[PDB]
Short mmCIF file of all heavy atoms in Angstrom, two decimals:
data_model
loop_
_atom_site.label_atom_id
_atom_site.label_comp_id
_atom_site.label_asym_id
_atom_site.label_seq_id
_atom_site.Cartn_x
_atom_site.Cartn_y
_atom_site.Cartn_z
N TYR A 85 63.81 104.53 99.82
CA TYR A 85 62.67 103.94 99.24
C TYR A 85 61.54 104.93 99.03
O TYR A 85 61.17 105.68 100.01
CB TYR A 85 62.07 102.88 100.28
CG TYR A 85 62.96 101.63 100.31
CD1 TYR A 85 64.19 101.65 100.91
CD2 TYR A 85 62.48 100.41 99.84
CE1 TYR A 85 64.94 100.49 101.04
CE2 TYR A 85 63.19 99.22 99.92
CZ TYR A 85 64.46 99.32 100.53
OH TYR A 85 65.18 98.14 100.59
N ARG A 86 61.12 105.04 97.78
CA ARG A 86 60.00 106.00 97.47
C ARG A 86 58.57 105.46 97.65
O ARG A 86 58.22 104.35 97.13
CB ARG A 86 60.11 106.37 95.98
CG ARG A 86 61.15 107.33 95.70
CD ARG A 86 61.14 107.66 94.22
NE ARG A 86 62.39 108.29 93.86
CZ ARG A 86 62.83 108.47 92.67
NH1 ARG A 86 62.14 108.07 91.53
NH2 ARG A 86 64.06 109.04 92.44
N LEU A 87 57.68 106.28 98.17
CA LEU A 87 56.26 105.92 98.27
C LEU A 87 55.69 105.91 96.90
O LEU A 87 55.84 106.92 96.11
CB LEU A 87 55.59 106.90 99.17
CG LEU A 87 54.11 106.79 99.37
CD1 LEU A 87 53.78 105.49 100.17
CD2 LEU A 87 53.46 107.95 100.12
N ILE A 88 54.91 104.85 96.48
CA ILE A 88 54.24 104.79 95.25
C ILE A 88 52.75 104.63 95.44
O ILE A 88 51.93 105.25 94.59
CB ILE A 88 54.83 103.64 94.40
CG1 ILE A 88 54.01 103.53 93.08
CG2 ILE A 88 54.74 102.26 95.12
CD1 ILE A 88 54.69 102.62 92.01
N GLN A 89 52.30 103.91 96.43
CA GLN A 89 50.82 103.87 96.79
C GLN A 89 50.60 103.41 98.19
O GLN A 89 51.45 102.87 98.87
CB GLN A 89 50.21 102.86 95.76
CG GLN A 89 50.81 101.43 95.73
CD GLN A 89 49.86 100.38 96.27
OE1 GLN A 89 49.10 100.58 97.15
NE2 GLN A 89 49.92 99.21 95.61
N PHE A 90 49.32 103.63 98.60
CA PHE A 90 48.78 102.98 99.82
C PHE A 90 47.45 102.42 99.56
O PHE A 90 46.71 102.80 98.65
CB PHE A 90 48.91 103.83 101.03
CG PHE A 90 47.85 104.98 101.15
CD1 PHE A 90 46.56 104.68 101.39
CD2 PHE A 90 48.28 106.26 101.05
CE1 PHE A 90 45.60 105.66 101.56
CE2 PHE A 90 47.39 107.30 101.17
CZ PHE A 90 46.05 107.02 101.45
N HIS A 91 47.05 101.40 100.35
CA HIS A 91 45.79 100.68 100.28
C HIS A 91 45.55 100.06 101.64
O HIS A 91 46.36 100.10 102.49
CB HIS A 91 45.80 99.75 99.17
CG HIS A 91 46.77 98.60 99.40
ND1 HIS A 91 48.04 98.55 98.84
CD2 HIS A 91 46.62 97.51 100.19
CE1 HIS A 91 48.62 97.54 99.27
NE2 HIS A 91 47.87 96.82 100.09
N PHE A 92 44.41 99.48 101.73
CA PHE A 92 43.98 98.89 103.00
C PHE A 92 43.43 97.47 102.73
O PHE A 92 43.09 97.12 101.58
CB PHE A 92 42.75 99.65 103.62
CG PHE A 92 43.11 101.11 104.08
CD1 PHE A 92 43.07 102.08 103.13
CD2 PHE A 92 43.31 101.41 105.43
CE1 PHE A 92 43.24 103.42 103.53
CE2 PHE A 92 43.56 102.73 105.76
CZ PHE A 92 43.55 103.74 104.82
N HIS A 93 43.41 96.69 103.81
CA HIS A 93 42.76 95.35 103.81
C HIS A 93 41.74 95.43 104.99
O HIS A 93 42.17 96.06 106.08
CB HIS A 93 43.76 94.26 104.12
CG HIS A 93 44.81 94.12 102.99
ND1 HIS A 93 44.67 93.31 101.92
CD2 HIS A 93 46.00 94.79 102.83
CE1 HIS A 93 45.81 93.47 101.15
NE2 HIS A 93 46.53 94.38 101.70
N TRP A 94 40.60 94.96 104.84
CA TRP A 94 39.62 95.10 105.92
C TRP A 94 38.61 93.98 105.96
O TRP A 94 38.61 93.17 105.05
CB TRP A 94 38.89 96.46 105.88
CG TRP A 94 38.07 96.60 104.60
CD1 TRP A 94 36.75 96.24 104.46
CD2 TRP A 94 38.50 97.11 103.34
NE1 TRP A 94 36.33 96.53 103.17
CE2 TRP A 94 37.40 97.05 102.50
CE3 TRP A 94 39.70 97.60 102.88
CZ2 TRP A 94 37.44 97.48 101.15
CZ3 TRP A 94 39.76 98.09 101.52
CH2 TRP A 94 38.67 97.98 100.69
N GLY A 95 37.81 93.92 107.05
CA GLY A 95 37.01 92.80 107.26
C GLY A 95 35.47 93.08 107.12
O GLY A 95 35.11 94.27 106.96
N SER A 96 34.63 92.04 107.20
CA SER A 96 33.15 92.26 107.14
C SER A 96 32.62 92.54 108.56
O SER A 96 31.47 92.96 108.71
CB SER A 96 32.49 90.97 106.63
OG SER A 96 32.99 89.85 107.36
N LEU A 97 33.46 92.32 109.55
CA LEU A 97 33.14 92.57 110.95
C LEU A 97 34.36 93.18 111.64
O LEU A 97 35.45 92.99 111.25
CB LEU A 97 32.82 91.26 111.77
CG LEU A 97 31.71 90.39 111.14
CD1 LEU A 97 31.80 88.96 111.70
CD2 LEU A 97 30.37 91.02 111.44
N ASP A 98 34.12 93.91 112.81
CA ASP A 98 35.22 94.64 113.40
C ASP A 98 36.44 93.81 114.00
O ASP A 98 37.51 94.28 114.13
CB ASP A 98 34.73 95.54 114.58
CG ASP A 98 33.74 96.59 114.08
OD1 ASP A 98 33.68 96.89 112.90
OD2 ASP A 98 33.08 97.21 114.94
N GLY A 99 36.16 92.53 114.29
CA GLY A 99 37.16 91.62 114.83
C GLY A 99 38.01 90.85 113.76
O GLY A 99 38.66 89.93 114.16
N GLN A 100 37.96 91.26 112.55
CA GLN A 100 38.78 90.72 111.59
C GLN A 100 39.07 91.75 110.53
O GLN A 100 38.34 92.68 110.37
CB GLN A 100 38.22 89.42 111.00
CG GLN A 100 37.01 89.65 110.12
CD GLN A 100 36.20 88.40 109.91
OE1 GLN A 100 35.88 87.71 110.92
NE2 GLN A 100 35.74 88.15 108.73
N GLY A 101 40.13 91.51 109.69
CA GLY A 101 40.35 92.40 108.61
C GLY A 101 41.84 92.66 108.45
O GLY A 101 42.27 92.81 107.26
N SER A 102 42.65 92.60 109.49
CA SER A 102 44.11 92.77 109.32
C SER A 102 44.75 91.56 108.68
O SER A 102 44.14 90.46 108.76
CB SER A 102 44.84 93.13 110.65
OG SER A 102 44.68 92.15 111.61
N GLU A 103 45.88 91.74 108.11
CA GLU A 103 46.58 90.58 107.56
C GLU A 103 47.57 90.03 108.63
O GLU A 103 47.58 88.82 108.98
CB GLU A 103 47.29 91.05 106.31
CG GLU A 103 46.30 91.51 105.25
CD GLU A 103 46.84 91.28 103.82
OE1 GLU A 103 47.77 91.94 103.43
OE2 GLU A 103 46.25 90.46 103.13
N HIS A 104 48.43 90.98 109.13
CA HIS A 104 49.29 90.51 110.22
C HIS A 104 48.39 90.47 111.47
O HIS A 104 47.34 91.10 111.55
CB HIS A 104 50.39 91.54 110.45
CG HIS A 104 51.40 91.50 109.41
ND1 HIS A 104 51.26 92.30 108.26
CD2 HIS A 104 52.52 90.78 109.18
CE1 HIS A 104 52.32 92.08 107.41
NE2 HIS A 104 53.11 91.15 107.98
N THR A 105 48.78 89.64 112.43
CA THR A 105 48.10 89.54 113.72
C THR A 105 49.20 89.75 114.77
O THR A 105 50.37 89.53 114.48
CB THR A 105 47.37 88.28 113.89
OG1 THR A 105 48.27 87.15 113.70
CG2 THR A 105 46.24 88.14 112.94
N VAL A 106 48.78 90.10 116.00
CA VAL A 106 49.69 90.21 117.11
C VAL A 106 49.29 89.33 118.25
O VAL A 106 48.14 89.44 118.76
CB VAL A 106 49.81 91.72 117.56
CG1 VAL A 106 50.93 91.88 118.72
CG2 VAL A 106 50.06 92.67 116.46
N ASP A 107 50.10 88.34 118.57
CA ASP A 107 49.69 87.30 119.54
C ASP A 107 48.34 86.74 119.19
O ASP A 107 47.44 86.60 119.94
CB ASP A 107 49.71 87.89 120.92
CG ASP A 107 51.13 88.20 121.37
OD1 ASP A 107 52.03 87.59 120.91
OD2 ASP A 107 51.28 89.17 122.17
N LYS A 108 48.16 86.53 117.82
CA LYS A 108 46.83 86.01 117.27
C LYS A 108 45.68 86.96 117.25
O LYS A 108 44.64 86.64 116.78
CB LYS A 108 46.49 84.67 117.98
CG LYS A 108 47.51 83.61 118.00
CD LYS A 108 47.59 82.97 116.60
CE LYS A 108 48.55 81.76 116.62
NZ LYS A 108 48.01 80.58 117.42
N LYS A 109 45.89 88.16 117.85
CA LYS A 109 44.87 89.24 117.72
C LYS A 109 44.83 89.81 116.27
O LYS A 109 45.80 90.23 115.74
CB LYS A 109 45.22 90.29 118.68
CG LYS A 109 44.20 91.47 118.81
CD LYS A 109 44.58 92.53 119.81
CE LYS A 109 43.99 93.85 119.54
NZ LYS A 109 42.46 93.82 119.64
N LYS A 110 43.58 89.79 115.77
CA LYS A 110 43.28 90.50 114.50
C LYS A 110 42.70 91.89 114.74
O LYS A 110 41.92 92.09 115.71
CB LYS A 110 42.13 89.69 113.69
CG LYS A 110 42.49 88.24 113.47
CD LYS A 110 41.34 87.56 112.70
CE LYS A 110 41.85 86.31 112.02
NZ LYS A 110 42.04 85.20 112.98
N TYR A 111 43.11 92.87 113.93
CA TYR A 111 42.52 94.20 114.01
C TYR A 111 41.47 94.34 112.89
O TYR A 111 41.32 93.48 112.06
CB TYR A 111 43.66 95.19 113.85
CG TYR A 111 44.51 95.38 115.14
CD1 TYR A 111 45.65 94.59 115.26
CD2 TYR A 111 44.12 96.25 116.12
CE1 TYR A 111 46.45 94.74 116.46
CE2 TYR A 111 44.91 96.38 117.20
CZ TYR A 111 46.09 95.58 117.42
OH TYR A 111 46.83 95.79 118.58
N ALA A 112 40.70 95.49 112.92
CA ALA A 112 39.62 95.69 112.02
C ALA A 112 40.11 95.92 110.58
O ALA A 112 39.39 95.72 109.57
CB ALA A 112 38.79 96.91 112.46
N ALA A 113 41.31 96.42 110.46
CA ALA A 113 41.89 96.62 109.11
C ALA A 113 43.40 96.85 109.25
O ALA A 113 43.94 97.04 110.38
CB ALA A 113 41.15 97.85 108.41
N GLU A 114 44.08 96.88 108.11
CA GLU A 114 45.54 97.12 108.00
C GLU A 114 45.80 98.02 106.85
O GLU A 114 45.33 97.77 105.67
CB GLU A 114 46.27 95.85 108.01
CG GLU A 114 47.75 95.92 108.10
CD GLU A 114 48.49 94.55 108.16
OE1 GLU A 114 47.84 93.63 108.72
OE2 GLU A 114 49.57 94.36 107.61
N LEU A 115 46.55 99.05 107.07
CA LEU A 115 47.03 99.99 106.05
C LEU A 115 48.42 99.63 105.62
O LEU A 115 49.28 99.45 106.46
CB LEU A 115 46.99 101.36 106.68
CG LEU A 115 47.81 102.52 105.97
CD1 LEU A 115 47.19 102.78 104.52
CD2 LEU A 115 47.67 103.79 106.84
N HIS A 116 48.69 99.59 104.31
CA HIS A 116 49.95 99.31 103.72
C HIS A 116 50.40 100.48 102.85
O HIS A 116 49.73 100.78 101.81
CB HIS A 116 49.88 98.05 102.84
CG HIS A 116 49.66 96.72 103.60
ND1 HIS A 116 49.14 95.68 103.06
CD2 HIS A 116 49.82 96.51 104.91
CE1 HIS A 116 49.02 94.73 104.00
NE2 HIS A 116 49.50 95.21 105.10
N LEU A 117 51.43 101.12 103.27
CA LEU A 117 52.18 102.15 102.49
C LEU A 117 53.35 101.49 101.76
O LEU A 117 54.31 100.99 102.47
CB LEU A 117 52.59 103.27 103.45
CG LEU A 117 51.52 104.07 104.08
CD1 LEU A 117 51.65 104.05 105.54
CD2 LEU A 117 51.60 105.48 103.51
N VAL A 118 53.24 101.44 100.50
CA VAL A 118 54.14 100.66 99.66
C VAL A 118 55.27 101.53 99.03
O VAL A 118 54.95 102.58 98.45
CB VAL A 118 53.41 99.97 98.51
CG1 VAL A 118 54.36 99.05 97.69
CG2 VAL A 118 52.25 99.13 98.99
N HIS A 119 56.50 101.16 99.39
CA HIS A 119 57.69 101.93 98.88
C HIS A 119 58.67 101.05 98.06
O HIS A 119 58.79 99.81 98.33
CB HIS A 119 58.47 102.51 100.02
CG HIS A 119 57.68 103.29 101.01
ND1 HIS A 119 56.88 102.67 101.94
CD2 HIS A 119 57.66 104.54 101.38
CE1 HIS A 119 56.23 103.55 102.75
NE2 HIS A 119 56.78 104.73 102.43
N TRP A 120 59.36 101.56 97.16
CA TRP A 120 60.36 100.84 96.33
C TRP A 120 61.76 101.45 96.38
O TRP A 120 61.91 102.61 96.43
CB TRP A 120 59.90 100.64 94.88
CG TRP A 120 59.71 101.89 94.03
CD1 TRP A 120 58.54 102.64 93.98
CD2 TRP A 120 60.67 102.44 93.15
NE1 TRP A 120 58.75 103.63 93.13
CE2 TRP A 120 60.01 103.54 92.59
CE3 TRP A 120 61.96 102.09 92.77
CZ2 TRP A 120 60.69 104.43 91.61
CZ3 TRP A 120 62.55 102.93 91.85
CH2 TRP A 120 61.95 104.08 91.28
#
Side-chain angles (χ1 to χ4, degrees):
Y85 288 68
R86 285 182 196 164
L87 180 66
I88 177 167
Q89 55 115 323
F90 75 73
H91 64 266
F92 299 79
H93 302 266
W94 65 89
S96 49
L97 304 163
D98 295 346
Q100 67 200 47
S102 62
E103 296 209 294
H104 293 90
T105 55
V106 186
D107 294 332
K108 303 287 185 69
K109 185 179 156 62
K110 304 178 161 78
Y111 285 92
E114 188 176 325
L115 165 64
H116 292 160
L117 294 123
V118 181
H119 312 72
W120 61 274

